[PDB]
Amino acid sequence: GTILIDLSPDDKEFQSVEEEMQSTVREHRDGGHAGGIFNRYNILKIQKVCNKKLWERYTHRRKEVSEENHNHANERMLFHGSPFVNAIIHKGFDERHAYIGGMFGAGIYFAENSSKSNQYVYGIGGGTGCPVHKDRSCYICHRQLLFCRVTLGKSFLQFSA
Amino acid sequence: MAHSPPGHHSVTGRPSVNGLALAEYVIYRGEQAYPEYLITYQIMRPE
Numbered sequence A: 001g002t003i004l005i006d007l008s009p010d011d012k013e014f015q016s017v018e019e020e021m022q023s024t025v026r027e028h029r030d031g032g033h034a035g036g037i038f039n040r041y042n043i044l045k046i047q048k049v050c051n052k053k054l055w056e057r058y059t060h061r062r063k064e065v066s067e068e069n070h071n072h073a074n075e076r077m078l079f080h081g082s083p084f085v086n087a088i089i090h091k092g093f094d095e096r097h098a099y100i101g102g103m104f105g106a107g108i109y110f111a112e113n114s115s116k117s118n119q120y121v122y123g124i125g126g127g128t129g130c131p132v133h134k135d136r137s138c139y140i141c142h143r144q145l146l147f148c149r150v151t152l153g154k155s156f157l158q159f160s161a
Numbered sequence B: 001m002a003h004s005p006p007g008h009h010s011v012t013g014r015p016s017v018n019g020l021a022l023a024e025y026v027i028y029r030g031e032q033a034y035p036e037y038l039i040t041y042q043i044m045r046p047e
Ligand SMILES: O=c1cc(-c2ccc(O)c(O)c2)oc2ccccc12
Pocket: A079, A080, A081, A082, A083, A084, A096, A097, A098, A099, A109, A110, A111, A116, A117, A120, A124, B024
């Protein structure tokens, strides 16, 4: 049920998503090991993901959370990077997309920094880099990230490094 | 997949060392997220 619509570079929505992508690049403490060395991206394409069933599944849960939390979903737009982004856009998030070894337990992880999600595009820790050149810093090969809508509700604040 | 802490719907991982890092978040139900945009890109080699 999923379709992908190309946004024109002239479109304000392309421009605001490119800006959140470009503006939330940071340096990482691994010096680029996991995601590569770069300060900016060459954005080749931005596509809107539309799937009716997955959207309704999201809004249902969003209402349950909201009603348990004085009518506040606490919704955010956050990045997600993975070798399975082509499965996620078709079947949605589920326990197969969970980071069993993550710092906050077995769940599904999202980032405010685009460059944090870029570290997971070729796998946990960047895996072995691009399929074609085996390069975690490949400048030739095309990469893909998801920019996602996420419901936090009453969030348990974990302080951490 | 684990459960969220009793009385809560997600976890916020607040950075408490790297002052430039933004937050990270964890949900325990896949239904709490929706993939809005697919972005195709190259990282650019600094000049
Ligand atoms: O975008 C992320 C993807 C993933 C991720 C981790 C393990 C996986 O098997 C996966 O499919 C995605 O982890 C993150 C951790 C912190 C912040 C963002 C991410």
